[PDB]
PDB file of C-alpha atoms and ligand atoms in Angstrom:
ATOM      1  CA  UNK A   5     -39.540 -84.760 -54.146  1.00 25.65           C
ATOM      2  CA  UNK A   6     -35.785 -83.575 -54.842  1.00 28.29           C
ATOM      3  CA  UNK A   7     -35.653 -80.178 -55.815  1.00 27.89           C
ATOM      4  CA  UNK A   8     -33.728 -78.874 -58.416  1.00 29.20           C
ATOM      5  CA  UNK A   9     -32.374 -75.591 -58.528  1.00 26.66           C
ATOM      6  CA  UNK A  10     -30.043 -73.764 -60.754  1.00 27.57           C
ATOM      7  CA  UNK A  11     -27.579 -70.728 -58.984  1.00 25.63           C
ATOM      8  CA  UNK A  12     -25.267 -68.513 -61.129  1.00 25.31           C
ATOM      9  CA  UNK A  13     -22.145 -67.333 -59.669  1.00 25.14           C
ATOM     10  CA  UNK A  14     -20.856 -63.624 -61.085  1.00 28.75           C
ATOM     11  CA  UNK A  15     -18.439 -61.557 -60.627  1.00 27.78           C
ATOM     12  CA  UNK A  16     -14.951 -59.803 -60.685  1.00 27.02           C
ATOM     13  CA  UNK A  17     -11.460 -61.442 -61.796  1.00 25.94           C
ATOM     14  CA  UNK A  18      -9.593 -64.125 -58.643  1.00 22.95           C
ATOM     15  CA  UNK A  19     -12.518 -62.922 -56.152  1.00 26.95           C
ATOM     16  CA  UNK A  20     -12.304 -66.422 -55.625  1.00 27.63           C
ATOM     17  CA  UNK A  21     -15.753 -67.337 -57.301  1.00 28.43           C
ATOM     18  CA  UNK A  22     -14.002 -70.654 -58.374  1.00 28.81           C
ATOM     19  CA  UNK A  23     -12.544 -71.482 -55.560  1.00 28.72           C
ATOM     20  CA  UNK A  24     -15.836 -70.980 -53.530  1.00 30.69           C
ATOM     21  CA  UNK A  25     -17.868 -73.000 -55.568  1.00 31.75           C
ATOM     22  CA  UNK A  26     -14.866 -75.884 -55.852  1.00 29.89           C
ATOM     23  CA  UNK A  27     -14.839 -75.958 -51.855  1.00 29.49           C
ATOM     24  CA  UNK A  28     -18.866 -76.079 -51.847  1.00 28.10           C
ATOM     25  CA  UNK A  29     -19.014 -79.343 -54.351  1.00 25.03           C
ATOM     26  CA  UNK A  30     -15.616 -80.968 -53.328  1.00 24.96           C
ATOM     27  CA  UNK A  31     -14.617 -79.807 -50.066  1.00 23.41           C
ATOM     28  CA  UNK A  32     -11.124 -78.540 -51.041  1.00 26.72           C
ATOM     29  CA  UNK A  33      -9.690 -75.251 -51.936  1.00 24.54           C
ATOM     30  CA  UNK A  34      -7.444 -75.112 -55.117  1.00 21.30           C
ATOM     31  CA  UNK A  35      -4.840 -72.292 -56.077  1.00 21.77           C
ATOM     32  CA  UNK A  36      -5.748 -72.353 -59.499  1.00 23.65           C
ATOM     33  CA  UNK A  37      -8.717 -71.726 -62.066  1.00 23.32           C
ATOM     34  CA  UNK A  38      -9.383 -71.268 -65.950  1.00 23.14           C
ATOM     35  CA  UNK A  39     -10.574 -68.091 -65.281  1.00 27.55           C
ATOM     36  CA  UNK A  40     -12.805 -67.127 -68.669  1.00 29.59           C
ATOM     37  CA  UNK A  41     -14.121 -70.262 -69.023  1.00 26.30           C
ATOM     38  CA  UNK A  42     -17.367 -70.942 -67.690  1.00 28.03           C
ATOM     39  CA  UNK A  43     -17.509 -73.879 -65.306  1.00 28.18           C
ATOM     40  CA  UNK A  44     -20.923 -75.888 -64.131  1.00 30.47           C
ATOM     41  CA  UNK A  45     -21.162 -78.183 -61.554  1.00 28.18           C
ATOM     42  CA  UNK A  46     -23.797 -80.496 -59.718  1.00 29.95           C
ATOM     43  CA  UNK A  47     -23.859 -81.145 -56.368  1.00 28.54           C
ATOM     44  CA  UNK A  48     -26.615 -82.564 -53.797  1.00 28.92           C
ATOM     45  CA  UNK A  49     -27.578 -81.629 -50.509  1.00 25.37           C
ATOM     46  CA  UNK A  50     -30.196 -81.781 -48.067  1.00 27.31           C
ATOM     47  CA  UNK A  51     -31.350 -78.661 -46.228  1.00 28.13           C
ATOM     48  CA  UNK A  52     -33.777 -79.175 -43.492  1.00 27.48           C
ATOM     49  CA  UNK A  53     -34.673 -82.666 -44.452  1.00 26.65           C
ATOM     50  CA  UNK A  54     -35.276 -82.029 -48.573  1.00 27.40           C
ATOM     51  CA  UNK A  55     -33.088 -83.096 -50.989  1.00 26.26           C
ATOM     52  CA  UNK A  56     -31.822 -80.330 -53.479  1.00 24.55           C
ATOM     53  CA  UNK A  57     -30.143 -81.397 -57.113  1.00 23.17           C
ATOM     54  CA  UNK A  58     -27.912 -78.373 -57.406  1.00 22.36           C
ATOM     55  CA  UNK A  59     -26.594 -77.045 -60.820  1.00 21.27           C
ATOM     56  CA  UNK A  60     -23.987 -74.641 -60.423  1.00 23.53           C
ATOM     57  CA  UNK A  61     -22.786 -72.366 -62.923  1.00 24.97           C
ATOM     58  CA  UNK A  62     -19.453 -70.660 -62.220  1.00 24.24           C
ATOM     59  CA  UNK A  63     -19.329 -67.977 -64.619  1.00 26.47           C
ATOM     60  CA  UNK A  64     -15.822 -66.404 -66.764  1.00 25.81           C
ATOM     61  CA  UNK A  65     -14.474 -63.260 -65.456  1.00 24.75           C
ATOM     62  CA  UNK A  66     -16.746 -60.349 -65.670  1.00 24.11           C
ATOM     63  CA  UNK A  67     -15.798 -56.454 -65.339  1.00 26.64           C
ATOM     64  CA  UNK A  68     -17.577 -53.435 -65.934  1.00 29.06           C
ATOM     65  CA  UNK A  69     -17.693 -53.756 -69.890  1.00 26.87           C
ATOM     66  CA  UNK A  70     -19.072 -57.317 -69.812  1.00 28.48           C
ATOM     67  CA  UNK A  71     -22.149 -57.729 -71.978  1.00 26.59           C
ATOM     68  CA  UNK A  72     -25.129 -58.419 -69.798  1.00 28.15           C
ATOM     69  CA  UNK A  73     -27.969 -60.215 -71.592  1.00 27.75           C
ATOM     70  CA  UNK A  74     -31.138 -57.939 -71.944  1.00 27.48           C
ATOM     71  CA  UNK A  75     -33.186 -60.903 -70.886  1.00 27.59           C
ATOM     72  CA  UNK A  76     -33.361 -63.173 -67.942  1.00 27.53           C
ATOM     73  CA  UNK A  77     -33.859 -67.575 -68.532  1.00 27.00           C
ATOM     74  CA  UNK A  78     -36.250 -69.229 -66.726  1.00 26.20           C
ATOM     75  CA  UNK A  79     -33.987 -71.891 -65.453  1.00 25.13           C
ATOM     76  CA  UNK A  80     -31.753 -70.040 -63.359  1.00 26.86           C
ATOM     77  CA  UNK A  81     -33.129 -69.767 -59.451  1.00 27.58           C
ATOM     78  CA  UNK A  82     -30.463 -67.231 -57.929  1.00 29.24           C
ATOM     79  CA  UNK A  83     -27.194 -65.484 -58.215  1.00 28.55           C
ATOM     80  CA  UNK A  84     -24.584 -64.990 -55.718  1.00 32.01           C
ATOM     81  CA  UNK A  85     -22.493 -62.077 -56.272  1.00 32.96           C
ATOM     82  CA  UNK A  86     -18.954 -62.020 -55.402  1.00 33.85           C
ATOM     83  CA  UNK A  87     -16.330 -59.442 -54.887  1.00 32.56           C
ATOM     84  CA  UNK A  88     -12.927 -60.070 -52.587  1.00 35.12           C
ATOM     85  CA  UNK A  89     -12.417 -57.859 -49.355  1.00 33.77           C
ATOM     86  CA  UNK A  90      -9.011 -57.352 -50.537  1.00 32.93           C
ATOM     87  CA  UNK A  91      -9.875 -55.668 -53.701  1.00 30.92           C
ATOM     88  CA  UNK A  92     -11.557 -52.012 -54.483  1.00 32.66           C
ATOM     89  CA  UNK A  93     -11.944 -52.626 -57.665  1.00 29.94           C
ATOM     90  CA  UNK A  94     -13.968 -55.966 -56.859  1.00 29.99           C
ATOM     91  CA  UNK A  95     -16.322 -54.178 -54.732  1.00 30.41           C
ATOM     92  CA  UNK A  96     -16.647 -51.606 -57.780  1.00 27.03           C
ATOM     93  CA  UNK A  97     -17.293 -53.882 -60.152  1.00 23.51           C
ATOM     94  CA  UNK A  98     -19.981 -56.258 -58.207  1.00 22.60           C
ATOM     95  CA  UNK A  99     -21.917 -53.130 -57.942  1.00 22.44           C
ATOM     96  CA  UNK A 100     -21.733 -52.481 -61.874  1.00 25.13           C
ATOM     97  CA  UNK A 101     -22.809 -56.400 -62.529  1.00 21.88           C
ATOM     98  CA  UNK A 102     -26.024 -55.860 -59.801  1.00 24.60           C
ATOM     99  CA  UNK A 103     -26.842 -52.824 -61.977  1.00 23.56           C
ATOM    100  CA  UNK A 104     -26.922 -54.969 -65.452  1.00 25.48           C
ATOM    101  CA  UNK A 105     -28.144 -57.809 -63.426  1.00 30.64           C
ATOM    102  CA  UNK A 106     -31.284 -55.829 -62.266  1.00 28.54           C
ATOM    103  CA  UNK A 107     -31.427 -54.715 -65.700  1.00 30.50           C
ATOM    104  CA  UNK A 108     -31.861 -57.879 -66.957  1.00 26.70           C
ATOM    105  CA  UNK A 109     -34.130 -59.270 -64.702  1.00 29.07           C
ATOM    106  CA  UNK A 110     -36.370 -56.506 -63.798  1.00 29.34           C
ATOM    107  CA  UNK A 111     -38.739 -57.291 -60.842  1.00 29.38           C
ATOM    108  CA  UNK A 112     -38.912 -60.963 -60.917  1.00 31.98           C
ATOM    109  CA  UNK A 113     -38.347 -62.859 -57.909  1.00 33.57           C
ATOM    110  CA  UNK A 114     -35.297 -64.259 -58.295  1.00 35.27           C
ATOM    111  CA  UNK A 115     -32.860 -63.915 -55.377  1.00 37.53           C
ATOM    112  CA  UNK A 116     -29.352 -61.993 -55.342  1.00 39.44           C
ATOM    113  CA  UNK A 117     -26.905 -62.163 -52.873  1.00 40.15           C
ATOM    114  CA  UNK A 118     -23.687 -60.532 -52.029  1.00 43.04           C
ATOM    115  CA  UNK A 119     -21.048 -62.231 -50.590  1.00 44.46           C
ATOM    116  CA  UNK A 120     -17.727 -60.898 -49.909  1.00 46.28           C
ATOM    117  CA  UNK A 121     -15.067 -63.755 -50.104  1.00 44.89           C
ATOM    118  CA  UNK A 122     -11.314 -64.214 -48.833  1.00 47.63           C
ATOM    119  CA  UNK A 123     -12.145 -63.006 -44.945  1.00 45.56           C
ATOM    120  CA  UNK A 124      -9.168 -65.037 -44.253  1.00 42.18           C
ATOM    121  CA  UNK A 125      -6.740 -62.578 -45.639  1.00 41.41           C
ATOM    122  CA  UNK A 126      -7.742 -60.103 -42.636  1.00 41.27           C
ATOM    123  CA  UNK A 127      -3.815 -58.201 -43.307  1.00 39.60           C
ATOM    124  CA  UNK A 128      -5.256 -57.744 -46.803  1.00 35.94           C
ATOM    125  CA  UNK A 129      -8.737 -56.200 -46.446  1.00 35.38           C
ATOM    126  CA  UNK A 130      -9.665 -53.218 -47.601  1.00 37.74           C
ATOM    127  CA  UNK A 131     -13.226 -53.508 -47.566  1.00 38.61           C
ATOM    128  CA  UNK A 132     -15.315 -53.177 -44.584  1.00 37.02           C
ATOM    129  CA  UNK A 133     -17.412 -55.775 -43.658  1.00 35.84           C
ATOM    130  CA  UNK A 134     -20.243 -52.995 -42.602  1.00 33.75           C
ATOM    131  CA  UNK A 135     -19.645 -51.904 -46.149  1.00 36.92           C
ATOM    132  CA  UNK A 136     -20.422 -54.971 -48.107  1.00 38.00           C
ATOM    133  CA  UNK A 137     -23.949 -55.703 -45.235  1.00 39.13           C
ATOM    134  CA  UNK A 138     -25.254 -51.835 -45.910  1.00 37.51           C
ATOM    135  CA  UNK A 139     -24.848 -52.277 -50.094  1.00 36.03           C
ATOM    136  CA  UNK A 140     -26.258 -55.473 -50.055  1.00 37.59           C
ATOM    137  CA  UNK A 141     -29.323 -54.108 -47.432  1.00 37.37           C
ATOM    138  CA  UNK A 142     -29.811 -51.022 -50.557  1.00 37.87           C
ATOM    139  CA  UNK A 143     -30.357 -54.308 -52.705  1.00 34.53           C
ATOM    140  CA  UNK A 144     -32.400 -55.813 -49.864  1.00 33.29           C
ATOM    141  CA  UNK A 145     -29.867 -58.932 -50.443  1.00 32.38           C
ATOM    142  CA  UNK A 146     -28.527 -60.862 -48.351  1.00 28.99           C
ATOM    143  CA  UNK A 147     -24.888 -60.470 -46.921  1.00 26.50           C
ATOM    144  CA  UNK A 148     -22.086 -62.755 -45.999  1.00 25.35           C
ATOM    145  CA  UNK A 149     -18.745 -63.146 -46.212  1.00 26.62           C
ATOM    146  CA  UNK A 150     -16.743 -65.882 -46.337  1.00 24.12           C
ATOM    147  CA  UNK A 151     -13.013 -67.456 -47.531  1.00 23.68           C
ATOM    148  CA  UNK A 152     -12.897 -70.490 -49.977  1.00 24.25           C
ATOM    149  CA  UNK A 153     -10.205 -72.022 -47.430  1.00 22.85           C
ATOM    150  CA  UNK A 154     -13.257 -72.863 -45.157  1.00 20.29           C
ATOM    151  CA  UNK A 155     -15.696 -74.765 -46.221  1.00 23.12           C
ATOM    152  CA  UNK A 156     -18.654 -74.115 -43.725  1.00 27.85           C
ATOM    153  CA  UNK A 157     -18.585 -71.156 -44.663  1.00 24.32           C
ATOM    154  CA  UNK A 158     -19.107 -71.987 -48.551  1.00 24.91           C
ATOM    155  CA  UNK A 159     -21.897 -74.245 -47.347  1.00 22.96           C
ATOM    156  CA  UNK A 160     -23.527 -70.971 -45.935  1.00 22.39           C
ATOM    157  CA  UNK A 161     -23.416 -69.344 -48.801  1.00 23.01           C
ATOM    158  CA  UNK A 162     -25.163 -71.722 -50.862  1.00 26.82           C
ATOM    159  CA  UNK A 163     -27.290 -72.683 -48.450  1.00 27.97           C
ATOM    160  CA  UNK A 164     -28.925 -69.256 -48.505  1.00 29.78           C
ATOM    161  CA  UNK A 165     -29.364 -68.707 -51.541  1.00 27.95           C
ATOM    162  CA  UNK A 166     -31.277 -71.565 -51.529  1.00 27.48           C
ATOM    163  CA  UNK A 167     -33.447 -70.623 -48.735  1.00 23.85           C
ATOM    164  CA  UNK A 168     -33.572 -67.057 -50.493  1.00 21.37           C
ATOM    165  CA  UNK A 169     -35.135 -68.698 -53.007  1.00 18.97           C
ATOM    166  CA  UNK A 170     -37.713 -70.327 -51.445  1.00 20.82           C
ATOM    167  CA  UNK A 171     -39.139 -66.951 -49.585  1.00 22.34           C
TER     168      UNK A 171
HETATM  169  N1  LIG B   1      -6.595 -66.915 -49.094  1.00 22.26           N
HETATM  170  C1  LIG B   1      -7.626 -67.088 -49.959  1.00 22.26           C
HETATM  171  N2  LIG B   1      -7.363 -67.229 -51.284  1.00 22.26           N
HETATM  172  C2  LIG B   1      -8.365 -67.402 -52.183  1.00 22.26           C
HETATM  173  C3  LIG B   1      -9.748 -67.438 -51.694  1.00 22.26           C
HETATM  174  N3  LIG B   1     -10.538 -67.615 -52.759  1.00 22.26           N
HETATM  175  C4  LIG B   1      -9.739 -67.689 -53.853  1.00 22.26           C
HETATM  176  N4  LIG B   1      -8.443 -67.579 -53.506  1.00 22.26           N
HETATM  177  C5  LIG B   1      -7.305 -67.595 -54.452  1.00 22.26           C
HETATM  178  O1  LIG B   1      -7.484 -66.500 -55.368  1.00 22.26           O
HETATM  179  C6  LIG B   1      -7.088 -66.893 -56.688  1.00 22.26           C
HETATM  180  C7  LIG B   1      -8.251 -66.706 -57.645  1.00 22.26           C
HETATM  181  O2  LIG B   1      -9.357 -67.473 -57.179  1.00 22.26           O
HETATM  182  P1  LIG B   1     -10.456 -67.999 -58.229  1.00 22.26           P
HETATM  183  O3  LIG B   1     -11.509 -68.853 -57.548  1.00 22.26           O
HETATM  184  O4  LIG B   1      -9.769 -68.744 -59.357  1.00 22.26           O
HETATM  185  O5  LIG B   1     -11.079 -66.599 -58.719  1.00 22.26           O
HETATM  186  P2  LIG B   1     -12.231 -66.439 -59.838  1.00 22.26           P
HETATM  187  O6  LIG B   1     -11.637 -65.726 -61.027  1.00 22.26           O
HETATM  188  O7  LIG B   1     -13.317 -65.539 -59.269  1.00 22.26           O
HETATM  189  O8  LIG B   1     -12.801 -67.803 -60.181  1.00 22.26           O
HETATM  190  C8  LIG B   1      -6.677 -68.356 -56.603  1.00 22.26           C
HETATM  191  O9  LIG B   1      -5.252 -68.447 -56.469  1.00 22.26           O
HETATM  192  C9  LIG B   1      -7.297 -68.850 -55.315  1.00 22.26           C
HETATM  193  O10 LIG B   1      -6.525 -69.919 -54.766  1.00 22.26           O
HETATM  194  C10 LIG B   1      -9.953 -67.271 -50.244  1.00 22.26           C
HETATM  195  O11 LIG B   1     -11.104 -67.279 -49.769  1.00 22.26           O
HETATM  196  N5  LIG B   1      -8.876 -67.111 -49.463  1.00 22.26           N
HETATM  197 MG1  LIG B   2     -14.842 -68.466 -62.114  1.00 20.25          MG
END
């Protein structure tokens, strides 16, 4: 009766992916990551009264001339897509990985969210948050944003994808 699900996290260079996922399964935001090696964590939680076994899979640094597998795995129940409001070429780049993502995937039901991290750096931003809401509506995805430095806001984003999942 606990669920298990399985949630890939993708994207750019220090969009904070790490960090994100760090504050989600430990509740504390650190100011320092291997960032090409590929990190997985587990973490449980209960949404709504059911118990989730989480697997988390905090992927290396990807750009625009990361290799993209041509084929999707079974095991892997969402993928939250990350780009930092203080960085162009982050918000470039997410929308390259979608591209390959969708690619890969095809039509299967598999949900993909956008989330646009470091909100907290508001003298830094240079990406809108109306910006980041109407791409991720053209990918019919949902849209949040959120900074690693608060972790309620982590929660959300894991949380939906979990509910994504499950519509
Ligand atoms: N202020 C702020 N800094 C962040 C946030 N997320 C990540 N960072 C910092 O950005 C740098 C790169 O973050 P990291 O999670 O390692 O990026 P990754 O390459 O996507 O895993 C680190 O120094 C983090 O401490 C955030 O939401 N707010
Ligand atoms: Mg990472």
């Amino acid at each position: 009766q606990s669920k298990s699900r399985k949630i890939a996290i993708l994207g750019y260079r220090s969009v904070g992916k790490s960090s994100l996922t760090i504050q989600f399964v430990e509740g504390q935001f650190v100011d320092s990551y291997d960032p090409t090696i590929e990190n997985t964590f587990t973490k449980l939680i209960t949404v709504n009264g059911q118990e989730y076994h989480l697997q988390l899979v905090d992927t290396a640094v990807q750009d625009e001339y990361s290799i993209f597998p041509q084929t999707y795995s079974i095991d892997i129940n969402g993928y939250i897509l990350v780009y930092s409001v203080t960085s162009i070429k982050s918000f470039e780049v997410i929308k390259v990985i979608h591209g390959k993502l969708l690619d890969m995937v095809g039509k299967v039901q598999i949900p993909i969210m956008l989330v646009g991290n470091k909100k907290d750096l508001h003298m830094e931003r240079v990406i809108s948050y109306e910006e980041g809401k109407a791409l991720a509506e053209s990918w019919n995805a949902a849209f949040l944003e959120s900074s690693a430095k608060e972790n309620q806001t982590a929660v959300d984003v894991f949380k939906r994808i979990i509910l994504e999942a499950e519509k």
